[PDB]
Structure formats: structure tokens, C-alpha cells
């Protein structure tokens, strides 16, 4: 959860204002280093079918990709992968765990 994680609200994949700055820092880094590549890994909490979550995780990873592309990062430097609700960051059946799992992580 440090300088590379975007968190989301239940069933949403929009990027909140709160994360724009952290994301701008990554865009600046990638833009000034055209040979660097980053992978955005999207996730979802355990509520709902596996397929619904794979899709929601993809839209979340995609949202980050599009935000970075909106800041001039080349589409070639960014790839996305969705783990659905298959790779949680925290086990547990409550909102404390879930909120920590609805996320997209920039991985180098």
C-alpha cells in the first residue's frame, strides 16, 4: 500500500482525486525514462462471482493505464493484468480487509 497503490470504492473503478498526485509521480518517471515498463495489477474484494471480479479488476487496472496515458506515458510502457478476487492483499470477511483489497498496484 505505499506509493504504488490505487484504492477503490465498492464496485467502482474510477480514480479518486486523492491518488492523482501519486499517479502523476509515476507518469513523470515513465515519461522521462521511455525505456521503463510498468505493469498494473488490478484486484477486487471477494463479493460476487469470480468472473465479475476478473472484469472489475481489469477496469481498475485499465483506469490506471488510461490515467497514465492521459499524462503522456506511451501505451507501450504499460501493461495490465487482472487477478480478480484471486490474489487478495488481506484475508478476512469484513470491510477492513475488503477495502484493502479493492486496488490496482503499479509493479515494476
From Swiss-Prot:
Domain OmpA-like: 1-108
Topological relation to the membrane, as annotated: Lipid-anchor
Phosphoprotein among keywords: no
GO biological process, one term: cell division
Chaperone as UniProt keyword: no
Location of the protein in the cell: Cell outer membrane
One GO cellular component term: cell outer membrane
Key words, A-Z: Cell cycle, Cell division, Cell outer membrane, Lipoprotein, Membrane, Palmitate, Signal
Family: Belongs to the Pal lipoprotein family.
Oligomeric and partner information: The Tol-Pal system is composed of five core proteins: the inner membrane proteins TolA, TolQ and TolR, the periplasmic protein TolB and the outer membrane protein Pal. They form a network linking the inner and outer membranes and the peptidoglycan layer.
Described purpose of this protein according to its UniProt entry: Part of the Tol-Pal system, which plays a role in outer membrane invagination during cell division and is important for maintaining outer membrane integrity.
Protein name (record): Peptidoglycan-associated lipoprotein
Organism: Escherichia coli O157:H7
Residues of the full protein shown: 66 to 173 of 173
Amino acid at each position: 500500500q505505499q506509493n504504488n497503490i490505487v484504492y477503490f470504492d465498492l464496485d467502482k473503478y474510477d480514480i479518486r482525486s486523492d491518488f492523482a498526485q501519486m499517479l502523476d509521480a509515476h507518469a513523470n518517471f515513465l515519461r522521462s525514462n521511455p525505456s521503463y515498463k510498468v505493469t498494473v495489477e488490478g484486484h477486487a474484494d471477494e463479493r460476487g462471482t469470480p468472473e465479475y471480479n476478473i472484469s472489475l479488476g481489469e477496469r481498475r487496472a485499465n483506469a490506471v493505464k488510461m490515467y497514465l496515458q492521459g499524462k503522456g506515458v506511451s501505451a507501450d510502457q504499460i501493461s495490465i493484468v487482472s487477478y480478480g478476487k484471486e490474489k487478495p492483499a488481506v484475508l478476512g470477511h469484513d470491510e477492513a480487509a475488503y477495502s484493502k483489497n479493492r486496488r490496482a498496484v503499479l509493479v515494476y
